[PDB]
Symmetry: C3
Subunit: 199 residues, 3 copies
């Protein structure tokens, strides 16, 4: 049971789903188009040891970022070359965390899957790493995990990067995501790293 | 609300969902198995600059194609070696775009997720890059974005590559995908590159 | 139509969905959290020729495994270095097959999508390769296809790796997965390689 344009528009109209900011032009037949924020995270450790707290760097782009596939083997020279040639603000290799501009709130009877736009998929750019499931009760922005798999990709601030596909629950959740004490990522105001060391 | 074998068969029987060509043997408990077309696209530019129109090459296989992981570092020699050893028609590295044989039409009250078969997943071969969501109202073949993540994979023309998982909308869409002026990929007769420069 | 915590708990309570072993603490708003088994598979051939039967190796971890991105270029020296530094049992590069601890049974009117936890997604670790769709009627453990896309990741035996998102069918399947003669992966007791050579 998937929400259509009118269901989305009506659930928003009714304040039952929150989407801040909202643009009705981004409502498609059965999904809401979300946009890429200007804040990104890259991690800094040799390995991800999930028992530990992770070191990372935050960047804020002005207009654009070049995302290279892992093992592109970026030298300082290559970075400067790409910045000069393509006028991008940052060049990164492998995984970068991003965020939607949109802050969302889901009722205990709606769920969402975040999925990338096919336009991005068609250039081998992914925006979640087998994740994108948004629980009933969730409140926050959505953290994107971005990897290029063919060639470097230029992504622009505020571009449409993916889509929320909402679905009705059979029965509502007893305790929605944001009501749980265990929840790591509620009230997510920006791009947020992994907190798995809290398990 | 996911369609089962009988729902799929009945929606097809009723002409409410179109699947051309259709083979009832490919209907599973809750998905329709789709097959790999003979047309592929590979892109040709240094970076994907999504503000621009992209350069690419089209190939048509006779029987098979070898898909190597990115940074396999294919020399002309290695290519010739694989063609001789495995009798494949093309050898490619990183991302290749493919297409289903099947042309489909969805009513304004059905949606689909394209997903790969676990048999392919189990050899680390993907056939969409965080995409695969098919809108209510969509008409066309389905464009596959294919990447190998462990070792090179031989894919054969007309093999079963993935599956459509159909789902009911709560209310139908006011305007289905193919009725929208904005829609980039309606009436898709083959493998189609990214048209994101049209945003 | 997605099952919530109470739907899951009630379907389990009613024996209509089987989950062995079951921990009610792992029931979230709208998904059941699954755990990583100690058995893994790595394949051994130059290419995956899907017309053929595949060679592979089985490992059983005691506590942990380091999963490196493909083309990390692991020497014996690097392996020994990581084992000494991080006290992991195995170091692997590219794709490794894993399994859930949980054996599950689905009725002919329930379907599931396996998806990774965002905590793992946020470190660019995937646990299925465009797959994760569990058919109505399926009986078995779930085979995970695991790839790291940024930096090596330490995964621990019995950790929570992903989640089952169950959904109601519109009508039940005439023949569920485990009732079909064609089915490759029914009664799956561990991690299982690709049987696509049986098509
Ligand atoms: O992986 C996919 C995904 C979608 N499609 C088809 C079905 C879908 O209805 C259509 C567009 O899907 P998206 O909306 O996810 N792509 P995008 O947003 O770039 O195109 P548009 O601006 O036309 O919506 O393309 C494919 O062929 N392959
Ligand atoms: O990622 C997955 C996906 C599915 N499965 C299980 C559940 C599902 O019912 C079963 C088969 O799924 P697919 O139909 O997607 N695989 P395939 O088409 O290759 O096998 P078959 O020919 O048996 O349908 O394997 C896993 O263990 N891991
Ligand atoms: O890709 C995603 C997925 C989820 N999310 C949000 C929505 C979801 O409700 C929340 C947690 O999702 P998961 O349960 O899949 N992550 P995890 O299990 O690691 O966190 P927790 O222990 O809090 O459930 O994070 C993102 O921002 N990006
Ligand atoms: Mg779209
Ligand atoms: Mg199948
Ligand atoms: Mg969770």
């Amino acid at each position: 049971m998937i929400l259509s344009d009118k269901d989305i528009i009506d659930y928003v109209t009714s304040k039952r789903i929150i989407i801040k900011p909202f643009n009705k032009d981004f409502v498609g037949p059965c999904s809401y188009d979300v946009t890429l924020g200007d804040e990104f995270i890259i991690y800094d450790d040799e390995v991800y040891d999930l028992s530990k707290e992770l070191n990372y760097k935050r960047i804020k782009i002005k207009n654009s970022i070049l995302v290279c596939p892992l093992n592109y083997n970026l030298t300082e020279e290559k970075i400067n070359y790409f910045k000069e040639k393509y006028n991008v603000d940052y060049v990164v290799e492998g995984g970068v965390l991003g965020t939607t501009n949109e802050y969302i709130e889901l009722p205990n009877d709606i769920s969402a899957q975040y999925q990338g736009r096919s336009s991005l998929g068609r250039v081998f750019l992914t925006s979640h790493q087998t994740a994108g499931w948004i629980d009933a009760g969730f409140k926050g922005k959505i953290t994107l995990a971005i990897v290029a798999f063919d060639k470097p990709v230029i992504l622009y601030k505020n571009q449409r990067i993916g889509q929320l596909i909402f679905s009705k629950l059979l029965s509502p959740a007893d305790v929605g995501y944001s009501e749980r004490k265990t929840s790591k990522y509620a009230y997510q105001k920006s791009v947020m790293p992994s907190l798995i060391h809290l398990d």
